[PDB]
């Protein structure tokens, strides 16, 4: 019948015995990480890995939802899954961020980020998006902690636990009761539980203030039930300090009443890279113009996974 594009995206199934070196590496909402060695079998490559695991049936449903998203996006800016493992758990293998998330990473390097990196970090956020848009899927949950740290100079975007699939002609996704995080949220979404790509919109107007911020709280000390009532008075989160008008001034688009109102993904990459040619015309940061940011027996096979193709 009619509907959409058969999802051909092949699902990797990957052996136990080729991951070595497994040791955790953090846990919270988001389940537990390790980091680890995958050597796929007959290739002279070792590549660095991630691995995430939330053994209730309830959780292997969810991993596995989690993986079909992954498994159908190929994006420089968006997390690849390299596979899956069926162990007594069901695990899900990816590309290692050795930096870790962006929201810690601003947090921890506050005195060394420039212009420079700040302005690339929301294009790059904003092509991913715009990517996601393309394959018609919107994420429900971005923010600066599921924004991963391949290089300071590339992130990704990760954790598609709430990430829903748009059918063709299908607008809006209505979702039900459950855990969302309510200040990275539109309006629309607190109130009436619909989600769009001009929602995940909303919630990139809050990351991007979560990185010109360097890491502060949306709303700190703000019970999550007064969200609701303190957008509608027409409140909004203030101007960073670093922050041109230039800057808040999308930030506050993102923000409208009206969903299209709002600017899309792909006119803020366009937006921040005409800035991103001229950083200290936008970004007013201390210092900025003198500022710096970057095994063993494993080194003479290692691969990064960007570069290990099929
Ligand atoms: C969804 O993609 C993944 C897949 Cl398939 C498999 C494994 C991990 C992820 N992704 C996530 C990493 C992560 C990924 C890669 N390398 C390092 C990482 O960091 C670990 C830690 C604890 C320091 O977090 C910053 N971290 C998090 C996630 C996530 O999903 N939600 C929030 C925390």
């Known amino acids: 019948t009619s509907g959409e594009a058969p999802n051909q995206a092949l699902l990797r199934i990957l052996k136990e015995t080729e991951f070595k070196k497994i040791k ?32 209730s049936p309830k959780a292997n449903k969810e991993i596995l939802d989690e993986a079909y998203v992954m ?21 899900l293998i990816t590309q290692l961020m050795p930096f870790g998330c962006l929201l810690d990473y601003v947090r921890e390097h506050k005195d060394n980020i420039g212009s420079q990196y700040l302005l690339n970090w929301c294009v790059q956020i904003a092509k991913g998006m715009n990517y996601l848009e393309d394959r018609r899927l919107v994420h429900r949950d971005l923010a600066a902690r599921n924004v991963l740290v391949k290089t300071p100079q590339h992130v990704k975007i990760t954790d598609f636990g709430l990430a829903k699939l748009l059918g063709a002609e299908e607008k809006e996704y209505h979702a039900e009761g459950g855990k969302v995080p309510i200040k990275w949220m539109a309006l629309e979404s607190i109130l009436h539980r619909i989600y769009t790509h001009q929602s995940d919109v909303w919630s990139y107007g809050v990351t991007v203030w979560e990185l010109m911020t360097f890491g502060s709280k949306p709303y700190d000390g703000i019970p999550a039930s007064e969200i609701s009532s303190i957008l509608e008075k ?7 300090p670093i922050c041109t008008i230039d800057v808040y001034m999308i930030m506050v688009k993102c923000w409208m009443i009206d969903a299209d109102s709002r600017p899309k993904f792909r006119e803020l990459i366009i937006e921040f890279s005409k800035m991103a040619r001229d950083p200290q015309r936008y970004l007013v940061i201390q210092g900025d113009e003198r500022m710096h940011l970057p095994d063993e027996e494993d080194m003479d096979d290692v691969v990064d996974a960007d570069e290990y193709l099929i």
Do not use: M
């Not at 389940?31 to 050597?39: A, E, M, P, R, S």
């Open 234 to 240: 027409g409140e909004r989160l203030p101007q960073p």
């Open 24 to 55: 955790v590496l953090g846990s919270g909402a988001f389940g537990t990480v390790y980091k680890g060695l995958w050597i796929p079998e007959g290739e002279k490559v070792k590549i660095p890995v991630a691995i995430k695991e939330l053994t």
């Open 71 to 91: 498994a159908s996006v190929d994006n420089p800016h968006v997390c690849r899954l390299l596979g899956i493992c069926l162990t007594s758990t069901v695990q």
